[PDB]
Amino acid sequence: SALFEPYTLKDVTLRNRIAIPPMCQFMAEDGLINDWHQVHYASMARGGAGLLVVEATAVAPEGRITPGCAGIWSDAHAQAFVPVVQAIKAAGSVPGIQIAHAGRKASANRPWEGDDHIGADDARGWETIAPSAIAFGAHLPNVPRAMTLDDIARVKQDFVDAARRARDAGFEWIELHFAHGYLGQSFFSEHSNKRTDAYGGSFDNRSRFLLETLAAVREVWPENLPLTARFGVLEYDGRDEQTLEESIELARRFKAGGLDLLSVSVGFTIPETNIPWGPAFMGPIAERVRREAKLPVTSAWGFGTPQLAEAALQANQLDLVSVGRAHLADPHWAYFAAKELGVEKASWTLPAPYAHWLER
Amino acid sequence: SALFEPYTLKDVTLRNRIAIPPMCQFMAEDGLINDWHQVHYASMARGGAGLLVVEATAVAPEGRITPGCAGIWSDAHAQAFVPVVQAIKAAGSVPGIQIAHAGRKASANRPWEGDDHIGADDARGWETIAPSAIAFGAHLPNVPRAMTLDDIARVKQDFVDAARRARDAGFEWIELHFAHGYLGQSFFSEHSNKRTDAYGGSFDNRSRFLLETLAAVREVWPENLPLTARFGVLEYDGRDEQTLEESIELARRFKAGGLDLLSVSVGFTIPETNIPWGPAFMGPIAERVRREAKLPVTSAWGFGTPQLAEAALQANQLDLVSVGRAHLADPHWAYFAAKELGVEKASWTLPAPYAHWLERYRLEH
Ligand SMILES: Cc1cc2nc3c(=O)[nH]c(=O)nc-3n(C[C@H](O)[C@H](O)[C@H](O)COP(=O)(O)O)c2cc1C
Ligand SMILES: Cc1cc2nc3c(=O)[nH]c(=O)nc-3n(C[C@H](O)[C@H](O)[C@H](O)COP(=O)(O)O)c2cc1C
Ligand SMILES: CCOC(=O)/C(=N\O)C(C)=O
Ligand SMILES: CCOC(=O)/C(=N\O)C(C)=O
């Protein structure tokens, strides 16, 4: 089974090709994780996935999506991640973290608490920032404050500080969150970036915030640990061929700037789109990024059935298959996949106290 | 769905009829549980089961099955369970514990490390105790020493102390391990009990250790929390009708002694048996105990699919369905069962950070 072949990248060896992508839990308080996250991450890691990327973790308080989002904007926040890192590693998985800034989508309620913007004057809300003073719209109406050059410098340094904290907490894999309509994605997209200075307009200018942030993080993130990013490569906004071509060029520049692997996703920059509502539509798109930018990739969105994950690898569309919601449903999904694909000694995907009893 | 109806026993209410039965993890050191157990139990409790009975926990060091078994023979051992109790409760489940003494099956290797008795020249082992100096046989050849009267008094007091510690740690449900060929079961069975004193040689004498231990625990265990036991009611040794009749009479005496629920199992007292493993094969046996002894019951050993669990309740065989190995495979099995049975808002079997995203309407529209 291709899904259960190991994978090497820099000094890291993943025991299989199953990655758990970042999934916000909305359970932190003032950015601090707690026993929700400790059990959640340790259980999924014991389930057998080779890599576990911890949820979008804000580089600054205003970069949280919600009041429940994790943060890494102080040393105390970073120290709280140490037992999570160590439990993931003790399970034989590789601990990663996605560091993030929600941009204009920040200051929102938790998804099961309305999912909508909280006003900045509410005690629970705060002021949001973005490349341009233009709202997402729909349930996120609040107009963000357009960033100055000083704001750009400050946020970049927050990403750098977050990466250094993640390093010292023991994460072995980092992912910059440049996808999903948050700050980085919104600098890239002409829908949200109306700037006419050095950070807007041309392809070079729209790419600048992302490339400068990557380069600044690269100075502090160890050369021997994978440096990765998530990026939305199309929007399903009627401009897909041109947008994908530009995104592939940015991926080439990421590679030239030291990126080791790209998590290929959708932009979600604006609500006026027509994104597919079915599984594995990203397969051929991720494949094109991988082949044309000559860079390892992962992708997600419906690959959480064992045969689909296996097919994507056999087709060389992906190097790792990210499986998100299936791991919320079943933290031992990797074992389920091994069983379904007929892997020899499939139960030993799990630790001995489970594996011994579940042997075929 | 019957499987998702609440159940009340004494002053404890379970949110559904899915119980996670005790399952040894073999990961403790010197009886102390650790991060293995913390995550293991918290994750299963978040999975939605209404009751989680923590694994066989030794009342005394020599009553561990293996060097990896949990213990509760000191207050520090009990304190180690406090965060497990709290995590199970925080998840909305009810924390129980099975307190145990492995008897002649003690001093064994972990199942994936040979599963057999530790040899004499291995310093990890210890002398075992039992009603009589007779080995189980097969892969458990070590001969135990026959208990003295003082040993009997001491082990009973160890059960009392263990129950008091479990109570003080916050457990809301206790299960005495009188099954599976361990110390209590071995007092009841004529295969293993060769005594001629007050503790063997008649039905009353063979029942005595179990009834005295129950009564001693009852003095310290709160009236308002379920007092339960697991007991092997037949052996599949060619003596089933007579053995089941005696076991059901003992169950009636457990009820008279304040037992609130019986976990109905197989004796496993000796290896020379022919157990007819199959789907839900214990259903009719559990129903017979339930009806003849007039005691609520649970059982296990093949109910671990959503339809088998639901059917055992619809057939009036069980009050709670114990689902063991399926929860090792999938800690969120209770959610899986709710989904498979078409329960309304099935994903809300889980906490919100999972339930929101797994809502069937959200997934389908
Ligand atoms: C609860 C939840 C939280 C998510 N949080 C993040 C996040 O923090 N960062 C991110 O890049 N994507 C996030 N996403 C997207 C997932 O990483 C993934 O792409 C998506 O769930 C699709 O994969 P799946 O079909 O296997 O679930 C989240 C998805 C879910 C369901
Ligand atoms: C790993 C494991 C450990 C077990 N440990 C115990 C135990 O501590 N106490 C007990 O009474 N039964 C124990 N048993 C038996 C289970 O409680 C249960 O009866 C058995 O798994 C059958 O139910 P199932 O078909 O749902 O798995 C154990 C079973 C397993 C698989
Ligand atoms: C829909 C795209 O947005 C995401 O997946 C996400 N983070 O990236 C969350 C928290 O939902
Ligand atoms: C087979 C009967 O014995 C059991 O189920 C048991 N404990 O009760 C263990 C640890 O295996």
Residue numbers in the entry:
A (entry chain B): 2 to 361
B (entry chain A): 2 to 366
Sentences from the paper on this structure:
Interestingly, the binding mode of the oxime substrates also did not change in most of the structures. The propanoyl moiety of oxime 1b points into this cavity and is likely stabilized by hydrophobic interactions. Substrates with an acetyl moiety (such as oximes 1a and 1c) give the non-productive binding mode described above. It must be emphasized that such a residue (like Y27 in XenA) has never been proposed to be involved in a reaction mechanism of these enzymes. Previous experiments with XenA Y27F showed no involvement in the oxidative half-reaction. Looking at the results obtained for XenA, product formation was comparable for both tyrosine variants, the canonical Y183F and the non-canonical one (Y27F). The calculated high Kd for oxime 1b clearly indicates this enzyme’s low affinity for the substrate and might explain why this enzyme performed poorly in the biotransformation of the other oximes in our previous work. Both the Y183F and the Y27F variants of XenA showed a non-Michaelis–Menten behavior, with a linear increase of the rate over the concentration (bottom right).
To gain more insight into the reaction pathway, we determined the crystal structures of the two enzymes OPR3 and XenA in complex with the oxime substrates 1a–c, either by co-crystallization or by soaking. All the crystal structures obtained had a high resolution (1.9–1.35 Å) and showed clear electron density features for the oximes.
